């Protein structure tokens, strides 16, 4: 088979990153550990940290688009009622 072009990923042994020198890693066998260590602690304290950092980027846009929706629903209901017949003719016509 012919060769291919130049990519930004290789395989095992020639992955294509910088030369590494001075870093050491340690690990323990999974058969000698407790898989469920700290689940109760993380479910409350870690969960509170994650929520507190991102909840402002989601709720503010959501509340803006929900207030817009409710204000448009009430206006339409008032327009097609008996008390809104003076406005329905002056807008839709």
């Amino acid at each position: 088979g012919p060769p291919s072009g130049k990519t930004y990923m290789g395989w095992w042994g020639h992955m294509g990153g910088p030369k590494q020198k001075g870093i050491t890693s340690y690990a323990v066998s999974p058969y000698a550990q407790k898989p469920l260590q700290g689940i109760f602690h993380n479910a409350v304290f870690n969960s509170f940290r994650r929520f507190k950092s991102q909840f402002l980027y989601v709720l503010i846009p959501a509340g803006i688009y929900w207030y817009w929706w409710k204000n448009g629903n009430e206006y339409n209901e008032f327009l097609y009622s008996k008390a809104g017949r003076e406005e329905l003719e002056r807008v839709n016509v």
């Binding site: 095992w12 690990a27 323990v28």
Partner: protein, 431 residues
């Protein structure tokens, strides 16, 4: 042939050999590198080079004596070699230079010079000797937080803090009569050696050695000293092995002989009767490997060491070698056991029956400090011959099949996979 006597606390053992042209005497202590702590690591290395110091060894050369010393995990030895008939001076030298007078050796400008030289011996070991520094990290990771994990040479960071007062503490606690064996090998008689010792005082200290709180325990783990500037990869892999005083001591040794050693650049090494060779030769997977079986007082290690330049196919090398270990439990043949019997008897007869009385003194002294006697070579041959195929399968199913492992490596080891992929190879789903 081995004769062992007792005298007021010290043990005298000899291995007489009339055809020898050199006699050797010395003292072997039953304490080694596994009796230190992570803050005084390297004390036993300083005591070795103080004994072989320039001023101490100049005195010995005038009488015609040569000095040697060895440091291990369990024992350390101090030997004096001389011609036959000069054994009286060797005992005299050992008495007044190491046993009874250590003040002249431990003087300033002699401790400060020896410490300078040892600090250089371990600096270049840590950056030039790769195959022997991954076998040391294998001990460090497999016995972590236990006495069987400290390097025998010490640590560079730990050796900069040692002073002369730390060497006197270790000598007072370990160089004792109850922790020592007096050995004599070569051309020297048992009656002559014991008579000389009693003709003098020749008494060590009186106290007993401290006991260790926790014993050594194996833990499946790994350590990765990756270095992308080196041209090769060095890897060591082992499971928990056998202690010295075990019934499966010779069965584990015979198991390592089935896979043996290998040299890619030796024409005769490529023709060995090992079924692993035909897997790793079509594509050159490694340059060399050797299978070991190391035993200690508490535990042991069983596995292999490799060095390869084929950095893109490390996974293939590990996969094929571990698949041959599986056959020790299910399908090991009778021809493989008979061949390994013959090669183990030759290898044992080349280690105990060499021509070096210094090698014999270390071997004999260490075996008496553990079990109080020495097993002869004729009796060991009878035990090796008795091994059967059912014995190997029983031992492998207990120690090898689906067990935790320890891994150490350095160099270009990006192609070495994770722990779980390697540990999956300790068993087969087809069985």
């Amino acid at each position: 042939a081995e004769v062992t006597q007792l005298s007021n606390g010290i043990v005298v053992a000899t291995e007489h050999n009339p055809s020898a042209h050199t006699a050797s005497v010395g003292v072997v202590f039953g304490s080694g590198a596994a009796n230190e702590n992570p803050y005084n690591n390297g004390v036993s290395n300083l005591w070795k080079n103080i004994f072989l110091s320039k001023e101490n060894s100049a005195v010995a050369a005038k009488e015609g004596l040569a000095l040697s010393s060895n440091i291990s995990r369990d024992f350390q030895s101090y030997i004096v070699s001389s011609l036959p008939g000069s054994t009286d001076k060797s005992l005299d030298f050992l008495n007044q230079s190491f046993i009874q007078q250590k003040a002249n050796l431990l003087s300033s400008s002699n401790f400060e010079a020896t410490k300078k030289s040892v600090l250089k011996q371990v600096q270049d070991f840590e950056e030039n000797d790769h195959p022997n520094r991954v076998l040391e990290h294998l001990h460090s990771t497999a016995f972590q937080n236990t006495p069987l994990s400290l390097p025998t040479r010490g640590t560079l960071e730990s050796l900069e803090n040692l002073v002369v007062a730390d060497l006197e503490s270790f000598a007072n606690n370990h160089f004792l009569n109850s922790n020592a064996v007096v050995v004599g090998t070569g051309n020297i008689k048992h009656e002559d050696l014991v008579n000389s010792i009693e003709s003098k005082n020749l008494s060590l200290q009186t106290g007993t050695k401290p006991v260790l709180k926790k014993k050594a325990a194996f833990l499946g783990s790994e350590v990765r000293l990756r270095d992308d500037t080196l041209p090769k990869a060095w890897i060591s892999l082992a499971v928990e092995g056998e202690p010295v005083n075990s019934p499966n001591y010779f069965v584990a040794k015979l198991a390592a002989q089935i896979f043996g050693s290998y040299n890619a650049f030796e024409p005769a090494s490529r023709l060995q009767g090992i079924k692993l060779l035909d897997n790793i030769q079509e594509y050159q997977l490694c340059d060399n490997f050797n299978h070991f079986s190391l035993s200690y007082k508490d535990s042991g290690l069983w596995g292999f060491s490799t060095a390869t330049r084929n950095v893109t196919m490390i996974d293939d090398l590990i996969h094929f070698t571990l698949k041959q270990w599986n056959r020790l439990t299910i399908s090991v043949t009778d021809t493989e056991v008979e061949r390994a019997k013959s090669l183990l008897k030759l290898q044992l007869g080349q280690l105990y029956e060499s021509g070096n009385p210094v090698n014999d003194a270390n071997l004999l002294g260490a075996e008496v400090l553990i079990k109080g006697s020495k097993l002869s070579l004729g009796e060991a041959f009878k035990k090796i011959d008795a091994i059967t195929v059912k014995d190997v399968k029983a031992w492998a199913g207990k120690r090898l099949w689906d067990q935790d492992i320890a891994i150490a490596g350095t160099g270009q080891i990006e192609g070495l996979l994770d722990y779980m992929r390697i540990r999956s190879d300790m068993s087969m789903m087809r069985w």
